[PDB]
């Protein structure tokens, strides 16, 4: 959900292989729950610069 | 919702006509729902000073 | 809820007598609703350095 804190907007982003850690499980669904690499250790800030 | 992060409390606050942009729809309800004028472009800070 | 903003994690913290205010009422449940002593007036910080 964006700046307007009332509604959400689903997007898509494509990571790479070495940028995700996935939770293994017996889930048969075609969707694989999977977090980011290091978002449970410390908040990571972008490099929104040149 | 207040500082105590629970048990929200309804308020009122009346604006002027030059401070709202309201979506137009076919809704018949007596309540017109809409947002601020520039709250979907950047956060606006109060001027809590003299 | 913790840093992974998708799930909850219950803890227990054992406070002291002089650091809690509890709601008074006709409730019969064995659980007593209480808040921190001074979190409805300001945000409190931790004496985080040594």
């Amino acid at each position, epitope marked *: 959900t964006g700046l307007k804190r009332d509604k*959400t907007k689903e997007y898509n982003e494509t990571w790479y292989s070495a940028d995700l850690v996935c939770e293994q499980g017996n889930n048969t669904g075609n969707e694989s729950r999977c977090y980011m690499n290091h978002c449970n250790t410390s908040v990571i800030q972008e490099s929104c610069d040149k | 919702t207040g500082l105590k992060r629970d048990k929200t409390k309804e308020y009122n606050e009346t604006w002027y006509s030059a401070d709202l942009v309201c979506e137009q729809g076919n809704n018949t309800g007596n309540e017109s729902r809409c947002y601020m004028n520039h709250c979907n472009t950047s956060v606006i800070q109060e001027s809590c000073d003299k | *809820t913790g840093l992974k903003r998708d799930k909850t994690k219950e803890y227990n913290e054992t406070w002291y007598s002089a650091d809690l205010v509890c709601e008074q009422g006709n409730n019969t449940g064995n659980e007593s609703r209480c808040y921190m002593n001074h979190c409805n007036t300001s945000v409190i910080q931790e004496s985080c350095d040594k």
Partner: antibody
Amino acid sequence: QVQLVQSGAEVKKPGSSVKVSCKASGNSFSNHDVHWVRQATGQGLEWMGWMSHEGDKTGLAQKFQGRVTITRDSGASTVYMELRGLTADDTAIYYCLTGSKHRLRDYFLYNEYGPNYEEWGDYLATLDVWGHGTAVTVSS
Amino acid sequence: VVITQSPLFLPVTPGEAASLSCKCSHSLQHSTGANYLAWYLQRPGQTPRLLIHLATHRASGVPDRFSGSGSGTDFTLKISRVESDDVGTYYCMQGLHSPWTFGQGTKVEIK
């Protein structure tokens, strides 16, 4: 092609209560919603209530508000619908039927502290399998 | 919230087309764009059979002659080449707000 089995017809005095029992082959109720419909001879169909297959949102109709109670056995093996305050107008054939729902989000307040505030509402779309029905006669 | 079904009584000559109307106007405060409406046919001595769901999609096994159309408040059900098998009462089921209700129904016979 799920099969629904309902209890036999009953005859009751005015002002008493009836408790119907409904079952689905293969415990289909554990994955599909449950509903209840009635109709009087020569009259239109009348809706009664429902209950989510997850068992979260349970309610009744405005007409029978407080007059009916819907309950199921653990595991959704059986579903029981109980009605009280019977009268002559209550004489109807009571039907047990399955279905599903479209649980969508109706509100959202991104709570920066703690979890997010979500509100969900259930809207009835699917009505696939109908039960044979139970005939109830309110008479002395 | 009420439902108006017209006409009450619709004699149809065999091989002719038929039109049924189920109108709802109390869509207070909205929620989902596609208001849920479901059409069912109850033949004598038979359980009601689903015909249309979401007001535009045919149900499984329904012949193409049964078509449901409409959006917003006014909806219509169109039947082509009516036959004896189509004799019965057509019910339109609101699927918007809790509690939900049946439609008063429209009676169709062979003229």
